[PDB]
Amino acid sequence: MLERVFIDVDGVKVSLLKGRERKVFYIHSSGSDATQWVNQLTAIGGYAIDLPNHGQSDTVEVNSVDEYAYYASESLKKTVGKAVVVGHSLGGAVAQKLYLRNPEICLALVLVGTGARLRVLPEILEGLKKEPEKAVDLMLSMAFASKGEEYEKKRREFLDRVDVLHLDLSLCDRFDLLEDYRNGKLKIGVPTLVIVGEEDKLTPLKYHEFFHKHIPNSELVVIPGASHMVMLEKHVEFNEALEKFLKKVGVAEVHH
Ligand SMILES: CC(C)(COP(=O)(O)OP(=O)(O)OC[C@H]1O[C@@H](n2cnc3c(N)ncnc32)[C@H](O)[C@@H]1OP(=O)(O)O)[C@@H](O)C(=O)NCCC(=O)NCCS
Ligand SMILES: [Cl-]
């Protein structure tokens, strides 16, 4: 069912995965790629970006979350025009910056396992340069509710992508919109769905209650038996929540 497509953003080749036509645009997390969203792409539809430096996209120097938001926004415009933007962790930071720069292209926001500030444990971030296996194991212990096939696969991916993982996490570590939400300057005017796995230790419940408190039209969904990787660990529950929200916002199903 899925297709891989390619577009050009200012000379940078960007790959995306796409399912059935739907105005939904997914943005993956650090050290990951569009394949993070396969369970959503096949059931809900839409497009998932491979950010530059990830998946089948070109490599290019990226020094901020804002720069990734530029690639994401251009890619959204070229594929779906306007969309519900779904971001996980780093991708949720990218989604927030995308909304702030280009609110017109966001029909709604889905903030998954993310935060207004994404400081990274120094034992992970500094541990990746010296003993990456230990750092990866620590990060993943905080990201999965259970070991098993998804955990093992992600562990191997991270071991294969340590350099990009460290670059991505360094961008997270510098990402901070917290006070701008707190002091009321940053306003999210679109419908928002905030999703977190009950066991998530990388971006815990309080990060998601923070969004829910500061965003007027937000709904919070905590998914039991999942941690940070909720869209992979509990995909059926995740999809049901997302589909209910898409109905609410009017992003119709368009079968056949
Ligand atoms: C790395 C870490 C220990 C640094 O902690 P720190 O030096 O206290 O600095 P922070 O800026 O994160 O936190 C300071 C305060 O802001 C709050 N805060 C930070 N990020 C927040 C967010 N996204 N939402 C709401 N509150 C937040 C904290 O709760 C804390 O409040 P407190 O003083 O009342 O406890 C901490 O951020 C952490 O444990 N993070 C989770 C693990 C991780 O590595 N996540 C990866 C994210 S990509
Ligand atoms: Cl991340």
Author numbering: 1 to 256
What do the study's own words say?
Here, we report the biochemical and structural characterisation of a third esterase from the A. fulgidus genome, named AF-Est2 (locus tag: AF1537). This belongs to the α/β hydrolase 6 family and the X group of the ESTHER classification. AF-Est2 was tested against a range of p-nitrophenyl (pNP) esters and was shown to be active against small to medium acyl chain length esters (C2 to C8), which is consistent with its classification as an esterase rather than a lipase.
The structure has been isotropically refined to a resolution of 1.4 Å with a final Rfree of 17.5. The structure reveals, as expected, a canonical α/β hydrolase fold core domain (Asp1-Arg117 and Asp176-His254), and a cap domain (Leu118-Phe175) formed by helices α5-α8. The active site is located at the interface of the core and the cap domains with the conserved catalytic triad composed of Ser89, His228 and Asp200. The structure also contains two CoA molecules at full occupancy, several ordered PEG molecules and a single citrate molecule bound at a crystal contact. The AF-Est2 esterase structure has shown a novel binding mode for a CoA molecule which is located in a groove overlapping the active site of the enzyme where the pantetheine moiety is partially obstructing the alcohol binding pocket. There is an ion pair formed by the diphosphate moiety of the CoA and the guanidinium group of Arg117. The adenine ring of CoA is stacked in a pocket between the side chains of Tyr207 and Leu178 and its N6A atom makes a H-bond to the main chain oxygen of Arg117. However high activity of AF-Est2 towards the pNP esters suggests that the flexible CoA pantetheine group is displaced from the alcohol pocket upon substrate binding. The necessity of the CoA pantetheine group displacement for pNP ester hydrolysis was confirmed by incubation of the AF-Est2 with the disulfide inducing agent diamide which enforces the formation of a covalent bond between the thiol groups of CoA and Cys172. This oxidised enzyme shows no activity towards pNP-valerate demonstrating that this enzyme is inhibited by the formation of the disulfide.
